[PDB]
């Protein structure tokens, strides 16, 4: 759970070049932050891991 | 029949365009692996110049 | 349709091949002045952070040449070199004084 | 002191940076997310073929 | 390996669409040459007036 949370976070950041919304910037592999958040373990497991 | 075929062509075209855009992005030289560090100090490397 | 379908032929494989060639850390861009996004690996403070960083081998060599320990923070390199220059000036002055005294 | 310095050089040399394994994990996750998106796109073309 | 499978699936679906559309268009092509007995007109514009 912890490894997966860190990995998702690391990869989310790879995608979010904090750059300026350009409404037009082509993401790597066409992936958005939301596509990665879906690969997170179930919310009950994430809270358990953080506690 | 004409409207239906027209929709399929549009979907394929949009997908094709988006793919070309992504390929262009991935081919950027700055993203491509560890080119052997440059022998010359880049003008943007202020610390090495200093 | 034939033309557009041909454009999308092996589209997944083509993209994966281009992706496999990219350096992921080059994607991590940080803004130091709020305006210019630079890859974190190009930051001067990270030149010694990882053995795999592009400039690690070069700066390792510079640290050893100026006798600066590898565990020291990268921000100390210029201050240290400045002190070494100061020492050189002092040694020259001492030599000149001693040569005059002799 | 000479022994300690040799041992120190060895520890510094062993500084296990599992960066390669981590890179592979990041790539794997990104590609998994990519695969999921491409599966959705395949399902959409399948629907068009049925029509 | 998963992406290679998915890629084959996507290529198959794209080919299916190409084959499907070609088949569909074969129904609209007027057999110029009288001779071929076989292709019974399916569209009133085909004529038969």
Swiss-Prot record, chain E:
Subunit organization: Component of the HAUS augmin-like complex. The complex interacts with the gamma-tubulin ring complex and this interaction is required for spindle assembly.
Function of the molecule: Contributes to mitotic spindle assembly, maintenance of centrosome integrity and completion of cytokinesis as part of the HAUS augmin-like complex.
Family note: Belongs to the HAUS3 family.
Signal peptide interval: none
UniProt protein name: HAUS augmin-like complex subunit 3
Source species, domain of life: Eukaryota
Localization, UniProt: Cytoplasm, Cytoskeleton, Microtubule organizing center, Centrosome; Cytoplasm, Cytoskeleton, Spindle
């Amino acid at each position: 759970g912890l490894q997966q949370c860190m990995l998702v976070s690391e990869c989310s950041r790879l995608l979010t070049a904090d750059s300026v919304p350009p409404s037009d910037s082509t993401s790597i592999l066409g992936l958005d932050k939301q596509d990665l958040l879906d690969l997170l373990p179930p919310n009950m497991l994430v809270l358990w891991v953080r506690d | 029949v004409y409207r239906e075929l027209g929709s399929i062509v549009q979907e394929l075209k949009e997908s094709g365009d988006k793919l070309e855009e992504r390929l262009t992005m991935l081919s950027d030289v700055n993203l491509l692996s560890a080119s052997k560090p440059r022998s010359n100090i880049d003008s943007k490397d202020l610390t090495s110049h200093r | 349709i034939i033309q557009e379908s041909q454009r999308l032929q092996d589209s997944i494989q083509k993209e994966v091949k281009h992706f496999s060639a990219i350096c992921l850390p080059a994607l991590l861009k940080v803004s130091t002045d709020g305006f210019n996004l630079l890859p974190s690996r190009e930051l001067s403070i990270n030149r010694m952070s990882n053995t795999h960083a592009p400039y690690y081998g070069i700066f390792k060599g510079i640290y050893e040449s100026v006798r600066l320990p590898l565990y020291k923070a990268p921000e100390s390199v210029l201050s240290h070199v400045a002190d070494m220059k100061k020492q050189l000036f002092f040694l020259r002055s001492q030599l000149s004084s001693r040569s005059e005294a002799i | 002191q000479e022994q300690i310095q040799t041992a120190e050089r060895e520890i510094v040399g062993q500084d296990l940076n599992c960066e390669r394994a981590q890179d592979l994990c990041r790539r794997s996750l990104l590609l998994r997310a990519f695969n999921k998106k491409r599966e959705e796109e395949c399902e959409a073309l399948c629907q068009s073929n049925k029509k | 390996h998963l992406l290679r499978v998915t890629n084959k699936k996507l290529n198959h679906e794209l080919q299916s669409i190409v084959n499907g559309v070609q088949t569909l268009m074969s129904f609209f092509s007027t057999p110029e040459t009288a001779c071929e007995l076989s292709s019974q007109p399916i569209f009133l514009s085909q004529l038969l007036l």
